[PDB]
Amino acid sequence: IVNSHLSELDEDVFHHFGFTTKSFDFKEKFGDVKFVCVCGSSGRIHNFAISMAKLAGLALPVENIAGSHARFVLYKVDHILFADHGIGIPSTLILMHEVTKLLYYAGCKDVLFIRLGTSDGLGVKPGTIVLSDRCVNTKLEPYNELCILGKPVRRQTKVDSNAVNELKKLSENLSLKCSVVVGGTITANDFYEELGRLNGSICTFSKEEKLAFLQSVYDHGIRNMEMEGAAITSHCNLTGHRAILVCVTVVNRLETDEVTTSTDEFKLFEQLPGQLVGEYLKRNNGIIVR
């Protein structure tokens, strides 16, 4: 389904990328894109892009395509786009609207979005990669909820189960220094109270209450929790694209709220999704290997 209103526009402005439809020949510039890789940090996604450029053997430094005074960054390495989405569903939806419009104007069909994130784990050790087979909200329902013109709307979430399976199989043939698990993911709007953290500035529950909640979701098949998945996976489904989440876990919340703060091992954890995804991209014609 296509937004019929876009045909009504003579020029369209990407407010959060700092460019318009007059800035490029979108079809020429982006027409070959088949993957969009995203996470919450501009520095981290820039580093993954650089890392993909190295894999592709690409000699030109990776530079921002978005305007430098704009909110979000955008990089391109061969048939892959890279962008940040900031923290949370509202920020992410802005990015989803603007990138999926870009893809539309460029004629890109059936693109795979890959969120490479960090996440809280449940019942897996820190450093585990979780491939989302399912994304649910804090009510454990597979929907993203919105309120549009004041009326409640629910949009079903969906992940690319074929891609999940391919990544699972790839991980078995790689030698990654971690475990890879297929399981469900909770998206929340609050890093603290909605994820059952006891150490916000406000907390209306006990340790037992938090544990009862998290154990129940574990036994529902949830293995991690983050803040954007609902949004990405519901949005792609409606705009005709595919989505997966590939997130490393940085704490086992069934045991603690605190991340064992080895500054080295957190950066270690952060690299794991890219190692797996980079190879998937290389094996699925995301890049030219120079």
Added chain:
Amino acid sequence: IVNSHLSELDEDVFHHFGFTTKSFDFKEKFGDVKFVCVCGSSGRIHNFAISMAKLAGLALPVENIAGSHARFVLYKVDHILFADHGIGIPSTLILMHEVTKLLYYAGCKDVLFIRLGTSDGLGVKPGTIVLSDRCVNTKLEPYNELCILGKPVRRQTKVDSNAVNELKKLSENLSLKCSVVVGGTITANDFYEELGRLNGSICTFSKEEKLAFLQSVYDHGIRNMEMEGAAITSHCNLTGHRAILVCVTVVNRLETDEVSTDEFKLFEQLPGQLVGEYLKRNNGIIVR
């Protein structure tokens, strides 16, 4: 109301600032804080901190207190903290949790949070400063909704009406090149569909339907729309602090959907011109 769990912890980590309760003596470093100014952008709040430091005649370094690789920046000049909140309620709630904890460990009581931002206008000309007299959701209810351990929770929003009146009176005494109006503010969770924009990647409504929704909002006293207000005002209320929004409007959505580079930057400076003078006249900065 205090979070009792905090006293159980030995070292508490501010994940999004990149420091801990061990990094500093919080009472000595932050104990004099009575104001926290926030907006969406690190660059924008940085430049406002430098402007306040200039206004105060503070010659000392105004460096980022947060870790250079942390999610948010944090600056201080005299009795004011400065930090960015990103876009949207969830990002802003993280900032609100970590800053209000910081104030808690520092012994700061009854602090005024001030959001300086941009916003969609309803029936006011672009460049208008709206001082929020209430913050509501897209159903026009003065609450921020959460789902905590799977249970719906509704947290009332509140603004510091007295501070709103003082800014209004100050605007009448200053010569700012804008109008200043007191009126209501919608917080939404989506820049496009939830604010009735027709040019998202998805849209299930007509121009007439979004106009009816916005006209209704206006009829109920709403004069602008943005994406964080519900979060700041509900949170300050529960933690014993006060909050206000001072937002310039950059488009009149009742007339047009489209907001050039020149005039927008001029718009952005306007909340800072009014607030900076308010802070100068209400003991935010010492007279030196």
